[PDB]
């Protein structure tokens, strides 16, 4: 049970971090793809 709790907390951490990356970098696509093409 401790192992599943630990690994699950890591799952939320990865989910949040991946979301932040996706957001910032979709914004990067939007912005600089407009400034280029």
């Amino acid at each position, epitope marked *: 049970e401790a192992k599943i709790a630990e690994l699950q907390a890591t799952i*939320e951490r990865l*989910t949040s971090e991946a*979301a932040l990356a996706e*957001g910032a970098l979709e914004a990067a696509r939007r912005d600089r793809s407009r400034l280029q093409m």
Partner: nanobody
Amino acid sequence: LRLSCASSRSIDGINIMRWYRQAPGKQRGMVAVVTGWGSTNYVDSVKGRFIISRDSAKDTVYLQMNNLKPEDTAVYSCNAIYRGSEYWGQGTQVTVS
């Protein structure tokens, strides 16, 4: 303003699943994330905007459109992850305004 999908089987026996947004003339993009926990988060663009909810009973997940500005107009496709695999459906589109 409310959209859903159904899995083959084993809802909540299905671990992480999320939804993706395909703006036209653009490449793939993640939207929002439900987990097996019900732990949830969104992407910054739709933060505050969209709301996602899981129904354990009828093998499904939910996305509800909110206060949409036409800019989100796109074709959406609901995704899931199962023992290390992709799982993509056919997806569906959303319109202006």
